[PDB]
């Protein structure tokens, strides 16, 4: 219920054009390289009206918890302090916009069966990241 398809765990399987989006984010060379190697595992759980998305890689394990529509501060993996809002588009889709003062990153995550497609957009640049559902 409310993001039922999002519940559970997810491992990255493919990433296309990701160095473009986060060169544009000014992510350092070194953190970008790690971004291009590691395959995070994100977990969602819905807990009442608050959803939590945990990301686990060898780099960092970050997690954050949000109401939909409700702005909230966040530290990104790379280290930018951003103001985020996650909107519910549908039951199989949500959209996390991330505002720092240099750029705004929009992150569409969309569940379709065993795939969650994560589209990441900074201005005119776009990367797509697919996660295969675990178990
Ligand atoms: C612990 C984080 C692991 C991710 C890779 C590590 C570093 C990459 C560096 C910067 C990434 C910065 C911005 C990209 C914005 C959103 C990506 C999350 C999409 C997803 O949910 O796939």
XYZ file of C-alpha atoms and ligand atoms in Angstrom:
157
model
C 0.000 0.000 0.000
C 1.162 3.519 -0.916
C 4.432 2.507 -2.684
C 3.914 -1.235 -2.273
C 6.004 -2.019 -5.330
C 8.861 0.045 -3.867
C 9.048 -1.999 -0.674
C 11.934 -4.411 -0.322
C 15.516 -4.356 -1.525
C 17.054 -3.497 -4.862
C 20.572 -3.839 -6.278
C 21.939 -1.669 -9.078
C 22.515 -3.693 -12.241
C 23.036 -1.081 -14.940
C 23.931 2.565 -15.104
C 23.928 4.600 -18.321
C 25.398 8.092 -18.684
C 26.005 8.557 -14.956
C 29.419 10.226 -15.243
C 27.756 13.009 -17.218
C 25.229 13.919 -14.514
C 27.656 14.022 -11.676
C 30.581 15.659 -13.473
C 27.915 18.319 -13.931
C 27.265 18.125 -10.184
C 30.918 18.896 -9.563
C 31.364 15.585 -7.762
C 35.129 15.275 -7.342
C 37.059 13.041 -9.694
C 37.628 10.484 -6.958
C 34.036 10.231 -5.755
C 32.832 10.102 -9.369
C 35.082 7.128 -10.035
C 33.599 5.321 -7.031
C 30.157 6.338 -8.336
C 30.935 4.634 -11.633
C 32.135 1.372 -9.983
C 29.962 0.559 -6.967
C 26.590 -1.125 -7.163
C 24.474 0.111 -4.272
C 21.614 -1.753 -2.713
C 18.691 0.455 -1.846
C 15.940 -0.664 0.479
C 12.588 1.002 0.865
C 10.172 0.609 3.778
C 6.899 2.433 4.311
C 6.245 3.272 7.977
C 2.887 4.972 8.214
C 2.994 8.204 6.207
C 6.838 8.257 6.239
C 8.929 6.246 3.731
C 12.588 5.383 4.273
C 15.126 4.733 1.565
C 18.391 3.160 2.680
C 21.377 2.985 0.301
C 24.236 0.611 0.996
C 27.519 0.523 -0.857
C 31.144 0.071 0.069
C 31.428 3.874 -0.193
C 28.720 4.961 2.263
C 25.564 3.611 3.797
C 23.222 6.588 3.896
C 19.554 6.525 4.713
C 16.805 9.060 4.771
C 13.228 9.318 5.796
C 10.559 11.484 4.295
C 6.937 12.484 4.096
C 5.829 13.041 0.466
C 5.708 16.695 -0.558
C 7.504 17.661 2.609
C 10.830 19.412 2.137
C 13.727 18.002 4.185
C 17.480 18.472 4.448
C 19.746 15.740 3.266
C 23.435 15.056 2.858
C 24.105 13.325 -0.453
C 26.617 10.505 -0.780
C 29.129 12.824 -2.464
C 28.677 15.344 0.264
C 26.454 18.147 -0.923
C 24.001 19.470 1.698
C 20.776 19.568 -0.349
C 17.135 20.514 0.219
C 15.043 17.630 -1.009
C 11.413 16.927 -1.699
C 10.042 13.519 -2.747
C 6.683 13.701 -4.564
C 4.399 10.715 -5.138
C 3.656 10.607 -8.883
C 1.866 7.275 -8.705
C 1.961 4.078 -6.662
C 4.820 2.710 -8.800
C 6.586 6.084 -9.243
C 8.117 8.843 -7.136
C 10.315 11.869 -7.795
C 13.059 13.215 -5.559
C 14.261 16.675 -6.460
C 17.503 17.711 -4.795
C 18.340 21.375 -4.557
C 21.797 22.616 -3.860
C 22.884 26.164 -4.868
C 24.860 25.108 -7.969
C 22.310 22.597 -9.384
C 18.968 20.851 -9.008
C 18.936 17.032 -9.391
C 15.602 15.350 -10.162
C 15.536 11.626 -9.514
C 12.607 9.727 -10.919
C 12.424 6.202 -9.480
C 9.823 4.001 -11.128
C 8.970 0.392 -10.278
C 8.103 -1.841 -13.209
C 8.028 -5.476 -12.127
C 11.523 -6.484 -11.079
C 13.049 -3.309 -12.379
C 13.242 0.033 -10.660
C 14.433 2.535 -13.161
C 16.096 5.524 -11.601
C 16.277 8.428 -14.007
C 18.610 11.187 -12.828
C 18.439 14.623 -14.450
C 20.578 17.689 -13.905
C 19.329 20.293 -16.333
C 19.593 18.802 -19.802
C 21.758 15.826 -18.709
C 20.167 12.442 -17.966
C 21.384 9.159 -16.621
C 19.324 6.068 -16.105
C 20.030 3.511 -13.454
C 18.305 0.184 -13.285
C 17.962 -1.810 -10.098
C 17.022 -5.512 -10.086
C 14.727 -6.443 -7.218
C 16.391 -8.666 -4.612
C 14.670 -11.952 -3.635
C 26.383 5.534 -1.227
C 26.068 6.143 -2.595
C 26.445 5.229 -3.752
C 26.158 5.956 -5.063
C 27.439 6.160 -5.854
C 28.459 6.949 -5.047
C 28.897 8.159 -5.414
C 28.377 8.871 -6.653
C 28.654 10.333 -6.518
C 27.696 11.232 -6.645
C 26.263 10.883 -6.952
C 25.570 12.208 -6.917
C 24.410 12.518 -7.488
C 23.548 11.614 -8.286
C 22.148 11.855 -7.759
C 21.332 10.831 -7.460
C 21.858 9.412 -7.648
C 21.001 8.399 -6.883
C 20.237 7.527 -7.877
C 20.124 6.143 -7.299
O 19.483 5.911 -6.270
O 20.770 5.176 -7.938
